[PDB]
């Protein structure tokens, strides 16, 4: 049960502007409707932000 990643790459998990995060940072987005949920986790792929979580379908 090892950490998913090291701390130098977990340290860069931040909260705030989608425009100001570099390629080295992971972006979190706290859901505003619910009080303790998450709505998306993003990191820059090619200058664009993309969700790390796989999209689900029926």
């Amino acid at each position: 049960m090892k950490r998913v990643l090291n701390l130098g790459n977990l340290s860069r998990i931040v909260e705030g502007d989608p425009n100001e995060i570099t390629d080295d940072e992971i972006l979190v987005i706290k859901d505003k409707i619910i009080e303790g949920k998450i709505i998306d986790i993003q990191k820059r792929v090619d200058g664009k932000l993309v969700s790390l979580i796989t999209e689900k379908y029926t």
């Binding site: 425009n19 100001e20 390629d23 940072e25 664009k48």
Partner: protein
């Protein structure tokens, strides 16, 4: 001003072309006089204190002669068109500070080592358009400038609604967000500003500048948000204030070099050029060479000024006279 000389130049104002001597009644009159053989040329001018004659011009020792149309001495005020580069983003990002730095060189001193900087800062928001950004940035610039209890600011800041694209709506530190109402403002303009001029102490001079945008973070990368394009100027500083300091200077080779130094104790010099008008100009360069051993040349200039009504009637009639008298061929501007 203080100009360089080909060992001398003298200036004579031409307010009226006369056909002969004894017609020189008013001051500033002028008549070109030459031999019938066309050997020498000189100008009989009506000074305020009488009539006077130019130096003589050996027409076979004249080097060059050309007239200036008075549109070549007007200084066009440099104006930039600041905008947003759609490359980065055609609209403001929602959380970044858009600072704009105006880099002024050869500020009070003469050297470009004399630098002055003025900032216009703005932060954008979720719904800020490009027009709302432009007006808030113009206001910030004008308020960081034009705090002068002294005079008009270093640069004139305007805006443009796309409906006009020609009229420039000013923006002063007294302007309010309320009187700027259009919603299609598409640029911020910054125009070079004419500086003060007092005869013999403050020559016509300007302070050049460059809009230097700073870096914003758009996609994690740092990028410049603006485009400082140089548009064709629309306003010029006319000739009147160069000819004025020119006469001030060239009337000390013919007259008094002391100009106010012993203030009560002065040779009052009545100048004939008004710095409020525009003057064509005509320079003639020629030399004097001596005899057997004195072959060294003494080169001199004789420059004349004449108002431009937009068609150059005065100087062109003066040109015709000099050409019919001296047989020369000076081009009529």
């Amino acid at each position: 001003m203080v100009i360089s000389i080909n060992q001398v130049r003298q200036l004579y104002v031409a307010k009226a072309l006369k056909a002969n001597t004894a017609a020189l009644t008013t001051a500033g009159d002028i008549v070109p006089k030459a031999d019938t053989a066309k050997t020498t040329l000189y100008f009989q001018s009506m000074s305020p204190a009488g009539i006077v004659a130019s130096d003589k011009i050996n027409l076979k020792h004249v080097l060059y002669a050309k007239a200036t149309p008075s549109e070549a001495l007007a200084h066009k005020l440099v104006r930039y068109s600041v905008t947003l580069d759609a490359d980065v983003s055609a609209t403001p990002v929602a959380g970044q500070n858009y600072i704009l730095r105006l880099a002024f060189r050869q500020y009070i001193g003469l050297s470009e080592e004399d630098q002055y900087f003025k900032y216009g800062e703005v932060i954008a928001r979720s719904g800020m358009t490009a027009s709302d950004f432009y007006k808030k940035m113009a206001i910030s610039l004008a308020k960081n400038l034009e705090n002068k209890t002294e005079s008009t600011p270093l640069v004139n800041i305007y805006l443009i609604s796309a409906a006009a694209a020609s009229t420039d709506v000013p923006v002063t530190s007294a302007t309010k967000e309320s009187d700027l109402t259009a919603t299609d403002y598409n640029q911020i303009i910054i125009e070079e500003t004419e500086q003060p001029w007092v005869l013999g102490m403050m020559p016509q001079a300007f302070i050049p500048f460059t809009p230097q945008f700073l870096t914003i973070t758009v996609d994690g990368e740092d990028r410049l948000w603006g485009v400082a394009t140089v548009v064709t100027p629309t306003k010029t500083v006319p000739d009147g204030h160069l000819i004025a300091d020119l006469e001030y200077f060239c009337m000390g080779a013919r007259g008094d070099i002391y100009r106010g130094m012993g203030y009560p104790n002065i040779i009052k010099t009545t100048y004939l050029v008004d710095p409020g008008a525009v003057y064509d100009v005509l320079d003639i360069h020629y030399f004097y060479t001596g005899s057997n051993e004195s072959v060294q040349k003494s080169e001199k200039t004789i420059t004349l000024v004449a108002v431009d009504d937009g068609s150059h009637t005065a100087m062109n009639a003066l040109i015709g006279a000099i050409n019919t008298a001296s047989g020369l061929t000076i081009a009529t501007l």
